[PDB]
C-alpha cells in the first residue's frame, strides 16, 4: 500500500504548481525540490509557485540550496506552513514572496537551530553557516541582526500570530 | 503483500467514493497523503461530502494537527467513521467531523487520553509540550462543547470510551449497526 | 515466485466475491478486508459474500472492525475455515450468516484468547477486561450459548474439531466436497 | 533469482494446470496453492491437476489446509515428487489420486515429522498429539497401511527411496523417462 | 539489478534454449531450472537444450531434482562449464548428453563434496545421499565406484583437460568451430 | 514517496542537457554520470552540457573518472554549484569550461580533502598529486598555492572561490 | 542510483555495443556480462564490442569466466579503463584485442592481487593454480616473461596509464576523441 491514483496524487499537486517540502530536508529532497522549481518556472515564469512546508528542518546546505533556487526563479512563491516549520523549514517559509507567506491556524514555527551537516566540519565553519542564516532571516523578517541572533537563542516554537508579528509570515488563515 | 484490483486498485476506488483512510499510526507522510487527498476531493466538488475512515492509535501531534487544519480548511462537509479504534490524535480527527456526521461502529474504542512519551518529530522543551497540550484541550472543547476543565480532567484518565459514551461526551453523533437504508 | 497471473489470482478470488483472512490479523489486513467487503456490497447487496479464514488471531480491535463491517453490510456472508481459526479468527468464523458457516474436515478451531500482536498500544487492566467482555457477548450472540458457557470454554487452552465447533454453535456445516 | 518471461514461467506452468509446492509450507504458500487449485477446478472440474512437490515440510495446519482442498475439488490430482517430500510434503504427495502419485528416481521421501516448531502459535501437549493422530489417519487412509504400521514407521528418523515409498503406499510409480 | 532490455537479456537466452545454473543451487533455483527445461522440451523435444554452469554447488536434493529432470526430458542436453563447476555443479556438468559436455579453457572443476543443507539429517541419510552421488558420477564418467569414491575424497579442483580424461566432459573449447 | 511525473523529473532534466552530481560520488554515480555525458555528446557535440553539483565528495577514482569524461567530450560543460561542492565535488566544479563555472550565492566550496579502497601510502600520495595538478590547471594557481590551500580544513564562499579560480560567476538571478 | 530514461541509459549503451564492468566482479556480474557479449556477437560476428572497465577486482573464477567469453567470441573487443582497473579488472583490460586497449589519462591500473575473491574456501595448491593461470594470461597479453609478471605482481602498487602502456597492459592513452 503506497500512493493512490486519481481521475498519482503528488503528480496532481505538481500540475497545480505545488512543491512539497513535507519532511526532513536532505540533499535528495533539495534536488527533487530544485528540479521541480526550475520545471515550473519553464512552464511559466509569471505564474505563482506554491510550497507546502511541513518539515522539522534538516541539512543546512540542502536548505540553502532550495533557498537559493527560490531566490533565483522569477516566479512569485507562496509558502504555506502546515503542521510545523522548524529550523531550515522556517527559513524556507520566511523566504516566500512578501505578502504570500501563510500558515494554517495550529502550525508550530521554530527559527531555533538544533544542536544537520553532511560531513564533519570545523567550529569556524558552523559559525559561518550560522551567520548566513542570521542574514537571511534578517533580510526576510525585516528584523535587525541582533534581534535575530537573540531570538534564535530561545529554544521555543512560535504560534502563527507570533510568526506574523516577527516577520516570518504574512497571513494566518482558517479557510 | 498484494493490494487486489477491482473492475483498478482498491484504495483508488475508495478515493473515487470520496473516502479517505486514516487507518494506522499517524506520521508526517500519512498527513502528507491525507492532506493531498482532501484538497483533491475538494477541487472535484467543494460541496459534496467527504468521508474519513479512522482506525488509528494516534501518532505525531503536529501531523494530526496538520490533518485537522486541512479538515477545517476545506469547504466540504466531512463524515468521520470510527472502526476498530480512534485513540489520541485519532479521536481528535474523529471529533473534528462535521456536526451530526460523526459516527462509530458498535464495537469501536475511543480514547482522548494522550500517550506518555513518539508524538514528536524532534525532542522539545517542557513549555512546548504544554502549548501543544492546550491546543488539544481547546480543539476537543470546541467540537465536544465541553468546558476546558471537563476536557482536561477527562484526558487525565487512562481509559477508552465505548461509542455510546463517546456520543454522550460529544465526540461523535451516532453509533451505527446497520445502514439506515 | 510470488503471486501468479490468471488468464492476478487474488483479484480473481475477488471477482468470485471471495475475501481472504488467511494470515494474522492487524490494522492493515482489517483495512483491506473492510474495503473489499464494502466494495462487494456495492456491486450487489444481495449476492452472498465469502470469507476464507486461515488465521491464528491478531489484534482485537482490528478483528472487531472486520466483525462490525460483516454485521453492517446487507449481504449474507458465508464463512469458510481452512487450516485453522484461532482467537479472533474463530470470532469471524462464528460471525457468518446463520447456516452459512463452514469448515473443511481437518481444520482446528480455538476460541481461547492468547495471553498478553494483541493491542496496538499498551492498555490498562480494566480495558483488557472490557475487550474480553465484548468477545464474550459476540461469541454468546452467534453461538446461542450463555455467558458462563462461553467464559468457561474460553478458559480452556484447547482446540476444537470442526464437529465439536458445530456442536458448540461456532459453525453450521462441515464439508468434504461440494456439499 | 528472477523469473524469466515467455508469456512469466510460473504463470505458464499454471496454464498447464501445474501447481508448484516447492520449498517450505506455511500459511502464505497454502493460501496461494489453494487459490490455484480452486481456480483450476473452475476452468475444468474434470481435467487432471498436476502438483509438483519439492518440500522439506512446514506448518501442519497449512499442510492440512492444502490437503483438505485437494480432497474437496472434483479434479483428479497427479502428484510428482521432485527432490524431496518430507513430513507434510510427503502427506501431500501421498494424498494424490490413487495411481497418479509419482516420483523421479533420485528423490527422498520422509514421513517422520520434525521435532519442535510446524506451528503458527505455541500449543499444548494434547493439541500436538491431536494433530499427530490426524496425520496417522491420513497416512493410513492413502497408504492403506494400519495405524500401528504408520505410527511405528513415523518414529524412525529416516528417508525412503522412491521404490521404498512405492512398496509402502506413499506413491504409485517411479518414472525415469516420459511414459508413452 | 539493472537488467538491460534487448529489442530482457535473460529471456533472450531462453529463446536460444539456454538455461542458466549460474550460481549456488537451492530449491528456488531448481524450481526455475526445471520449469524452463520442461518449457523448452514442449516447444521441441528434439532440439538441443543448453545449460550454462558457473556454480559452486549447493543443496544436494535440489541438484538431484535438476539432474532427474535432465535425464527425464527427451532433448539432448549440452552442458557448458564457464568459470567453475563444483560439487553438484560438476554433477550437472557430467549429466549432459554424451559427447555434448563442454568447458571453456580456464574453468575449474571439482567433484569433491563440501563438508548444513536442506534440513538436519541423520548419519545414515547423508551416507545414502553420498552413495547416490557416487553412482551418478560412475554412470556418466564410466569410472568404477572405487575410482569415484577415492577421487571425491581429494579436496582439489581439476582442469578442463583433467576432467576430460576423467570422463566428466567431452570437449574443451577456446572458440567456436 | 519517489519521483513525480511531468508530461521522470530527472529524465526531464536530461532532456534539458542537465546532468546531476547531487550526492556523494561513488562508482555507481560515476558510471551513470559518464553514460549521460556520452549520450548528450552524441545528441550533439556542440550544444552546452550543464552539470548540477551538490556533493560532499566521494571516491577519488570515481571522481577522476567523471573528470576525465568531462575533458574528453567536445561539448562545453557549464558547472553549477548549488548547496556545496566539497572534496572531489569542488574538482568537478573547477573542471567546467573556462568562463562557464558558476555557483549560487549561499554555496560552500571546499578543496580540502578528507582524512581517510585500502591502498598503500605511496598510492594515496600519487592520487593526491594528481589532484594538485588538476586544481592547478583549472584555477591557474601554482602548485605550492594549491598544496598550502588544500591543507586548510575550511570552506570558501562563492566569491573567494571566484578569486581563487575555482569558478567564474556568482549568480543571484537570471 | 535511479537509472534515467532516454528517447534506460544502460540499454542505450548496449545498443552502442558497450558492455559495462563498472564495479566489483562476482558471479552475478559475470553472468550479465557474458550474456551481453554473446548477444552482441549474434547482432554481428565482426562488429567491434566496447567494454568499459571501472573495477577494483573480484572473484577470480568470475573474472576468468568473462575472460574466456572475451576470447571465445569472434568480435574484436575494445577495452577502456576509466577510474581504475585493479586485479581481475586489469586482466580484462589487458585481454582486449591488440591495439584496442585504452585508458583515460587519470586512471589507475593494478595487476597486484589482493590477499582476500573466494566463492568457496579452497586449498593452498588450488589458489596457486589460479595464480599460475593469471601469470600465464598476463604473460600472453603483455608479451612479458613469466618471471617479469611474477615479480611485478608482488609489488603492491598502482600504475599510471603510460606505465601500463609500456608494460603491455594497454596500447593507447587518450585525452580527447582521436
Ligand atoms: C526548461 C527547464 C526544465 C527543467 C529544468 C530546467 C529548465 C531550464 N534550465 C534552467 O532552469 C537552468 C539551467 N538550464 C540549462 C538548460 N536548461 C536550463 C542552467 C542553470 N540554471 C541555474 C540554476 C541551477 C540550479 C539551481 C538554480 C538555478 C538554471
Ligand atoms: C485543485 C487542486 C487539486 C489538488 C490539490 C490542490 C488543488 C488546489 N489548490 C489548493 O487547494 C490550495 C492551494 N493551491 C495553490 C494552487 N492550487 C491550490 C494553495 C493553498 N492551499 C492551502 C492549504 C494547504 C494545506 C492544507 C490546507 C490548505 C490550498
Ligand atoms: C460504492 C462503494 C465502493 C467502495 C467502497 C464503498 C462504497 C460505498 N460506501 C459505503 O459503503 C460507506 C460509506 N460510503 C461513503 C461513500 N461511499 C460509501 C460511508 C459509511 N460507511 C460505513 C462503514 C464504514 C466502515 C466500515 C463499515 C461501514 C459505508
Ligand atoms: C470459480 C472460482 C474461481 C476461483 C476461486 C473460486 C472459485 C469458485 N468458488 C469455490 O471454489 C468455493 C467457493 N466459492 C464461492 C464463490 N465461488 C466459489 C466457496 C467455498 N469454497 C470452499 C473451499 C474454500 C477453500 C478451500 C477449499 C474449499 C469453494
Ligand atoms: C507444455 C508444458 C509447458 C511448461 C511446462 C510443462 C509442460 C508440459 N508438461 C510436462 O512436461 C510434465 C507434466 N505436465 C502436465 C501438464 N503439462 C506437462 C506433468 C509430469 N511432468 C513430469 C516431470 C515433473 C518434474 C520434472 C520432470 C518431469 C512433466
Ligand atoms: C552514441 C553514444 C551513446 C552513449 C554512449 C556513447 C555513445 C558513443 N560512443 C562513445 O562516446 C565512446 C565509445 N563508443 C563506442 C560506441 N559508441 C561510443 C567508445 C569509447 N568511449 C571513450 C570513453 C569512455 C568512457 C568515458 C569517456 C570516454 C567513447
Ligand atoms: C544468438 C545468441 C544470443 C544470446 C546468447 C547466445 C546466442 C548464441 N549462442 C551462443 O553463443 C552459444 C551457444 N548457443 C546455443 C544456442 N545459442 C547459442 C552455446 C555455447 N555457448 C558457448 C559459450 C558459453 C559461455 C561463454 C562463451 C561461450 C555459445
Q: G60-72 and G124-142 are packed helices; what angle lies between their axes, rounded to 10 degrees?
A: 40
DSSP, res G175: S
Best of C19, C50, C172 for a ligand 4 pocket test (most atoms within 8 Å of beta carbon): C50
Check if the beta carbon of residue A89 is closer than 8 Å to that of residue A25.
yes
Ligand 1 pocket at CB < 6 A: A 34, 38-39, 42, 69, 72; F 12-13, 16-18, 50, 52, 80, 82
Check if the beta carbon of residue B127 is closer than 8 Å to that of residue A156.
yes
Q: What is d(CA A101, CA A107) in angstroms, rounded to the nearest whole number?
A: 13
Is residue C75 classed as helix, strand or coil in its secondary structure? coil
Nearest residue CA, atom 9 of ligand 6? F38
Q: What is d(CA C110, CA C83) in angstroms, rounded to the nearest whole number?
A: 12
- Kindly report the backbone phi and psi dihedral angles of residue F80, in degrees, each rounded to the nearest multiple of 5, phi listed first: -130, 115
Per residue, what are the HEC states of chain E? CCCCCCCCHHHHHHHCCEEEECCCECHHHHHHHHHHHHHHHHHCCCCCEEEEEEECCECHHHHHHHHHHHHHCCCCEEEEEEEEEECHHHHHHHCCCCCCEEECCCCEEECCCCCCCCCCCCHHHHHHHHHHHHHHHHHHHCCCHHHHHHHHCCCCCECHHHHHHHCCCCEECCCCC
Using an 8 Å CB-CB cutoff, list chain B residues near A156.
125, 127-128
Nine cell digits for residue A118: 553532511
Q: What is d(CA G103, CA G43) in angstroms, rounded to the nearest whole number?
A: 26
Q: Do F and A touch (≥3 CB pairs < 8 Å)?
A: yes
Paired residues of D103 in beta bridges: D81, D174
Checking E118-127 for CB contacts under 8 A at 24+ apart, the result is E118/D56, E118/D84, E118/E59, E118/E60, E118/E61, E118/E62, E119/D56, E119/D57, E119/D86, E119/D114, E121/D159, E122/D157, E122/D158, E124/D158, E125/D108, E125/D158, E125/D159
Give partners of F (≥3 CB pairs < 8 A). A, G
Q: What is d(CA B70, CA A83) in angstroms, rounded to the nearest whole number?
A: 10
Residue with cell 467487503: C37
B54 to chain C, minimum CA–CA distance in Å?
10
**Cβ pairs bridging F and G (under 8 Å):** 89
Check if the beta carbon of residue C101 is closer than 8 Å to that of residue C94.
yes
Q: What is d(CA D68, CA D134) in angstroms, rounded to the nearest whole number?
A: 12
Residue with cell 506448518: D59
Method underlying the structure: X-ray
Active site (annotated) includes residue G102: no
Question: F61 and G23: CB-CB below 8 Å?
Answer: no
Check if the beta carbon of residue C73 is closer than 8 Å to that of residue B177.
no
Residue with cell 528418523: D157
Q: What is d(CA F160, CA F101) in angstroms, rounded to the nearest whole number?
A: 14
Chain D interface includes E16 (CB < 8 A): no
Question: Which ligand does the CA of A40 lie closest to?
Answer: 1
Check if the beta carbon of residue D9 is closer than 8 Å to that of residue E39.
yes
Instruction: Answer left, alpha or beta for residue F80, where phi above 0 means left and psi between -120 and 50 means alpha.
Output: beta
Paired residues of B78 in beta bridges: B50
| Of F169, F167, F115, nearest in space to F139 by CA | F167
Best of G80, G97, G101, G171 for a ligand 6 pocket test (most atoms within 8 Å of beta carbon): G80
Q: Do A and G touch (≥3 CB pairs < 8 Å)?
A: no
Q: Which residues 32-91 of B have a C-beta within 8 angstroms of A?
A: 32-33, 35-37, 40, 44, 62-63, 65-66, 68-70, 72-75
In the reported structure, the alpha carbon of residue A121 is separated from the centroid of ligand 1 by a whole-number distance in angstroms of 30
Beta strands in A18-156 (DSSP E): 18-21, 49-55, 77-86, 101-103, 108-110
Instruction: Say how many C-beta atoms besides its own lie within 10 A of residue E19's C-beta.
Output: 25
Paired residues of E79 in beta bridges: E51, E101
Instruction: Say how many C-beta atoms besides its own lie within 10 A of residue B135's C-beta.
Output: 18
Using an 8 Å CB-CB cutoff, list chain E residues near G74.
175-176
Chain B interface includes A9 (CB < 8 A): yes
Q: Please, after which residues is chain G broken with C–N above 2.5 Å?
A: 7, 116
Domain with C37 in it: what CATH number? 3.90.226.10
Q: D147-155 and D125-143 are packed helices; what angle lies between their axes, rounded to 10 degrees?
A: 120
Beta strands in chain A (DSSP E): 18-21, 49-55, 77-86, 101-103, 108-110, 171-172
Please state, in angstroms and as integers, the Cα–Cα distance from residue F115 to each residue in A119, F88, F128, following that order: 12, 13, 12
Question: Which ligand does the CA of E52 lie closest to?
Answer: 7
Please state, in angstroms and as integers, the Cα–Cα distance from residue D89 to each residue in D74, D178, G145, following that order: 22, 23, 60
In the reported structure, the alpha carbon of residue F38 is separated from the centroid of ligand 6 by a whole-number distance in angstroms of 6
D143 to chain E, minimum CA–CA distance in Å?
23
- Cβ-proximal residues to B178 (8 Å cutoff; 6+ apart), any chain: C71, C72, C74
In the reported structure, the alpha carbon of residue G80 is separated from the centroid of ligand 6 by a whole-number distance in angstroms of 10
Nine cell digits for residue D17: 494446470
Let me know how long chain B is: 181
Check if the beta carbon of residue B39 is closer than 8 Å to that of residue B70.
yes
| Of E99, G157, D126, E72, nearest in space to F120 by CA | G157
Q: What is d(CA F59, CA F29) in angstroms, rounded to the nearest whole number?
A: 10
Check if the beta carbon of residue G87 is closer than 8 Å to that of residue G116.
no
Is residue C13 classed as helix, strand or coil in its secondary structure? helix
Nearest residue CA, atom 11 of ligand 4? D38
Instruction: Using the Cα atoms of residue A33, residue A34, residue A35 and residue A38 in order, give the sign of their dihedral.
Output: positive
Give the distance between the most distant pair of CA atoms in chain B: 53
Q: How far from the centroid of its chain's Cα atoms is residue D122's Cα? A: 24
| Of B70, B61, B10, B59, nearest in space to B34 by CA | B70
Q: A27-43 and A60-72 are packed helices; what angle lies between their axes, rounded to 10 degrees?
A: 10
Give the distance between the most distant pair of CA atoms in chain A: 53
Nine cell digits for residue F83: 548547496
Catalogue the active-site residues of E.
87, 112
| Of B59, B65, B104, nearest in space to B81 by CA | B104
In the reported structure, the alpha carbon of residue F80 is separated from the centroid of ligand 1 by a whole-number distance in angstroms of 10
Q: Is B16 exposed, middle or buried (0-12, 13-18, 19+ CB in 10 A)?
A: middle
**Per-residue b/e over G35-71, b at no fewer than 16 CB within 10 Å?**
bbbbbbbeeeeeeebbbbbbbbbbbbbbbbbbbbbbb
First and final CA of chain E: distance in angstroms? 34
| Of E69, E71, E74, nearest in space to E34 by CA | E69
Best of D5, D6, D16 for a ligand 5 pocket test (most atoms within 8 Å of beta carbon): D16
Q: What is d(CA C176, CA D41) in angstroms, rounded to the nearest whole number?
A: 15
Check if the beta carbon of residue A91 is closer than 8 Å to that of residue A67.
yes
Q: What is d(CA D159, CA D110) in angstroms, rounded to the nearest whole number?
A: 5
Check if the beta carbon of residue C104 is closer than 8 Å to that of residue C81.
yes
**Pick among B84, B109, B112, B166 to test the C interface (most C CBs inside 10 A):** B84
Is residue B84 classed as helix, strand or coil in its secondary structure? strand
Nearest to G129 among E9, E104, E157 (CB): E157
Check if the beta carbon of residue F94 is closer than 8 Å to that of residue F70.
no
**Per-residue b/e over A105-143, b at no fewer than 16 CB within 10 Å?**
bbbbbbbbbeeeebeebeeebeeebeebbbebbbebbeb
Question: Which ligand does the CA of C47 lie closest to?
Answer: 4
Q: What is d(CA G53, CA G59) in angstroms, rounded to the nearest whole number?
A: 15
DSSP, res B51: E
Q: What is d(CA C98, CA C92) in angstroms, rounded to the nearest whole number?
A: 13
Q: What is d(CA E113, CA E155) in angstroms, rounded to the nearest whole number?
A: 8
DSSP, res F97: P
Q: Where are the alpha helices (DSSP H) in chain D?
A: 9-15, 27-43, 60-72, 88-94, 125-143, 147-155, 162-168
Q: Which helix (H) or strand (E) holds C163?
A: helix C162-168
Q: Which residue of E has its CA nearest to D156?
A: E122
F66 to chain G, minimum CA–CA distance in Å?
8
Residue with cell 532571516: A137
Strands A101-103 and G172-173, by their bridges, are: unpaired
Instruction: Answer left, alpha or beta for residue E96, where phi above 0 means left and psi between -120 and 50 means alpha.
Output: beta
Active site (annotated) includes residue F87: yes
Q: What is d(CA D53, CA D31) in angstroms, rounded to the nearest whole number?
A: 16
Is residue G126 classed as helix, strand or coil in its secondary structure? helix
- Cβ-proximal residues to C79 (8 Å cutoff; 6+ apart), any chain: C50, C51, C53, C92, C93, C94, C95, C96, C100, C101, C102, C171
Q: What is d(CA D12, CA D125) in angstroms, rounded to the nearest whole number?
A: 44
In the reported structure, the alpha carbon of residue D85 is separated from the centroid of ligand 5 by a whole-number distance in angstroms of 18
Radius of gyration over every alpha carbon of chain F, rounded to an integer in angstroms: 16
Paired residues of D18 in beta bridges: D50
| Of A149, A123, C110, nearest in space to D123 by CA | C110
Residue with cell 591495439: G99
Chain C interface includes D1 (CB < 8 A): yes
Range of the domain at B137: 1-181
- Cβ-proximal residues to F96 (8 Å cutoff; 6+ apart), any chain: F51, F70, F77, F78, F79, F167
C63 to chain D, minimum CA–CA distance in Å?
18
| Of B88, B87, B55, B54, nearest in space to B71 by CA | B54
Check if the beta carbon of residue C41 is closer than 8 Å to that of residue C75.
yes
Chain A interface includes B9 (CB < 8 A): yes
- Kindly report the backbone phi and psi dihedral angles of residue F161, in degrees, each rounded to the nearest multiple of 5, phi listed first: -60, -35
Check if the beta carbon of residue G114 is closer than 8 Å to that of residue G131.
no
| Of D76, D74, D27, D59, nearest in space to D135 by CA | D59
Is residue G116 classed as helix, strand or coil in its secondary structure? coil
- Kindly report the backbone phi and psi dihedral angles of residue C119, in degrees, each rounded to the nearest multiple of 5, phi listed first: -135, 155
Instruction: Answer left, alpha or beta for residue B75, where phi above 0 means left and psi between -120 and 50 means alpha.
Output: alpha
- Kindly report the backbone phi and psi dihedral angles of residue C103, in degrees, each rounded to the nearest multiple of 5, phi listed first: -155, 145
In the reported structure, the alpha carbon of residue F75 is separated from the centroid of ligand 6 by a whole-number distance in angstroms of 14
E175 to chain G, minimum CA–CA distance in Å?
4
Q: Where are the alpha helices (DSSP H) in F16-157?
A: 27-43, 60-72, 88-94, 121-139, 143-151
Instruction: Say how many C-beta atoms besides its own lie within 10 A of residue G173's C-beta.
Output: 17
Using an 8 Å CB-CB cutoff, list chain A residues near F82.
30, 34, 65, 68-69
- Kindly report the backbone phi and psi dihedral angles of residue A85, in degrees, each rounded to the nearest multiple of 5, phi listed first: -140, 100
Q: Which helix (H) or strand (E) holds D176?
A: none
- Domains of chain C: total: 1
Question: Which ligand does the CA of A78 lie closest to?
Answer: 2
Nine cell digits for residue E72: 527425464
Query: What is the number of the ligand 4 atom nearest to the C-alpha of D68?
Result: 27
Best of E38, E61, E67 for a ligand 5 pocket test (most atoms within 8 Å of beta carbon): E38
Resolution (A): 2.0
Ligand 7 pocket at CB < 6 A: E 12-13, 16-18, 50, 52, 80, 82; G 34, 38-39, 42, 69, 72
Check if the beta carbon of residue C20 is closer than 8 Å to that of residue D23.
no
Query: What is the number of the ligand 1 atom nearest to the C-alpha of F171?
Result: 22
DSSP, res A101: E
Q: Please, after which residues is chain D broken with C–N above 2.5 Å?
A: 7, 117
Check if the beta carbon of residue E156 is closer than 8 Å to that of residue E112.
yes
- Kindly report the backbone phi and psi dihedral angles of residue B165, in degrees, each rounded to the nearest multiple of 5, phi listed first: -65, -45
Q: Which helix (H) or strand (E) holds F170?
A: strand F169-170
Check if the beta carbon of residue E92 is closer than 8 Å to that of residue E116.
no
Is residue B154 classed as helix, strand or coil in its secondary structure? helix
Residue with cell 546531476: F20
Q: How far from the centroid of its chain's Cα atoms is residue G170's Cα? A: 11
Residue with cell 486461515: C54
- Cβ-proximal residues to B56 (8 Å cutoff; 6+ apart), any chain: B22, B23, B24, B25, B26, B85, B86, B87, B89, B90, B93
Check if the beta carbon of residue A159 is closer than 8 Å to that of residue A172.
no
Amino acid at each position: 500500500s503506497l500512493i493512490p491514483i486519481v481521475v498519482d496524487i503528488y503528480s496532481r499537486l505538481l500540475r497545480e504548481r505545488i512543491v512539497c517540502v513535507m519532511g526532513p530536508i536532505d540533499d535528495s529532497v533539495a534536488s527533487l525540490v530544485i528540479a521541480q522549481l526550475l520545471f515550473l518556472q519553464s512552464e511559466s515564469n509569471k505564474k505563482p509557485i506554491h510550497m507546502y512546508i511541513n518539515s522539522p528542518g534538516g541539512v543546512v546546505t540542502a536548505g540553502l540550496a532550495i533557498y537559493d533556487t527560490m531566490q533565483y526563479i522569477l516566479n512569485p512563491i507562496c509558502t504555506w506552513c502546515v503542521g510545523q516549520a522548524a529550523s531550515m523549514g522556517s527559513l524556507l517559509l520566511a523566504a516566500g514572496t512578501p505578502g504570500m507567506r501563510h500558515s494554517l491556524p495550529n502550525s508550530r514555527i521554530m527559527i531555533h537551530q538544533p544542536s544537520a551537516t553532511d560531513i564533519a566540519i570545523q567550529a569556524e565553519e558552523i559559525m559561518k553557516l550560522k551567520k548566513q542564516l542570521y542574514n537571511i532571516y534578517a533580510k526576510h523578517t525585516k528584523q535587525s541582526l541582533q534581534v535575530i541572533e537573540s531570538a534564535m537563542e530561545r529554544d521555543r516554537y512560535m504560534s502563527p500570530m507570533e510568526a506574523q508579528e516577527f516577520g516570518i509570515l504574512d497571513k494566518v488563515l482558517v479557510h
